């Protein structure tokens, strides 16, 4: 979502345009999507999926692939395209991949504040059913 930044972009911005705007179009489609069909909060799963995809892409470009410069790894977050605190959460060894909070224990929030996929793969998903009210991160 490109609105304005009161300045010019960095040098390596042209490479980001197509994939970034494809993901932004997916987000705009999921934002104006219909409510009929979403049970209670099913409409709020794919928005988290898209945000996760955007953070994944900008993080892979930041220093995982070492392609994006140091300006883009702060300017892309300086303007609104990804989350800095979320990537800081990814810096931990345990916080590999999960949503904001959909299967966490009693964190600062009464329901949870850790992650959607925070539950274990070896003991969670009681019996057989895996799901998450906030993001559905099975």
């Amino acid at each position: 979502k490109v609105k304005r930044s009161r300045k010019a972009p960095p040098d390596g911005w042209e490479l980001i345009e197509p994939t970034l705007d494809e993901l932004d179009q997916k987000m705009r489609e999921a934002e104006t999507e219909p409510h009929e069909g979403k049970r209670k909060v099913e409409s709020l799963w794919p928005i988290f999926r898209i945000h996760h995809q955007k953070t994944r892409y900008i993080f892979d470009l930041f220093y995982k692939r070492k392609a994006i410069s140091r300006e883009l790894y702060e300017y892309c977050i300086k303007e609104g395209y990804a989350d800095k605190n979320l990537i800081a959460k990814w810096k931990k060894q345990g916080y590999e991949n999960l949503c904001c909070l959909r299967c966490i224990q009693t964190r600062d929030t009464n329901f949870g504040t850790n992650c959607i996929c925070r539950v274990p793969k070896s003991k969670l998903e009681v019996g057989r059913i895996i799901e998450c009210t906030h993001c559905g991160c099975r």
């Binding site: 104006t32 219909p34 409510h35 009929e36």
Partner: protein, 176 residues
């Protein structure tokens, strides 16, 4: 009963399913002589019969708010909420006029602005006549091009307020 269509409705995100019209004018449509007949139920088919038998295109007249059967039938189709295929069939109908007019109107009030342009642009070539009732009861012969010009460019071409369709410049900068 005049609450919903049958049991459920994809709520138009603008204001509400039925309340896209002002509540005053809606309540006037209910308390009306024409609402007695044809309000027993009109889903998809009988709407076509009740539509072609009223050759007016107008809103409110009289000192009291006097709704035309044009406006009341627009509201009836609004409560019915037909599918887009029927509305597209009415939009592409050249023989009957006011059916196409109602298709355009409901598409303006029920539809994305992209589809609004896509289905209202080819209505910019009918130089034919259209009958419309002024607020003082007196009629006037108006061209259809003037009608769509007041619809898209102008606000409240009828008594209804329109839900702020975008400017063409932004869409031209972004899309078709």
């Amino acid at each position: 009963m005049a609450n919903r269509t049958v049991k459920d409705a994809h709520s138009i995100h603008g204001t509400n399913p039925q309340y896209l019209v002002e509540k005053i004018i809606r309540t006037r449509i209910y308390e009306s002589k024409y609402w007695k007949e044809e309000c027993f139920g009109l889903t998809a088919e009988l709407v076509v019969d009740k539509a072609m038998e009223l050759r007016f295109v107008g809103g409110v007249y009289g000192g009291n708010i006097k709704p035309t059967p044009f406006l009341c039938l627009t509201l009836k189709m609004l409560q019915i909420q037909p599918e887009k295929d029927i509305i597209v069939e009415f939009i592409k109908n050249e023989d009957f006029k006011y059916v196409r007019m109602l298709g355009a109107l409901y598409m303006r009030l029920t539809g994305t602005a992209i589809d609004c342009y896509k289905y209202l642009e080819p209505l910019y070539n009918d130089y034919r006549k259209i009958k419309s009732q002024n607020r003082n009861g007196e009629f006037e012969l108006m061209h259809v091009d003037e009608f769509i010009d007041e619809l898209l460019h102008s606000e409240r071409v009828c008594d209804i307020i329109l839900p702020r369709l975008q400017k063409r410049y932004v869409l031209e900068e972004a899309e078709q």
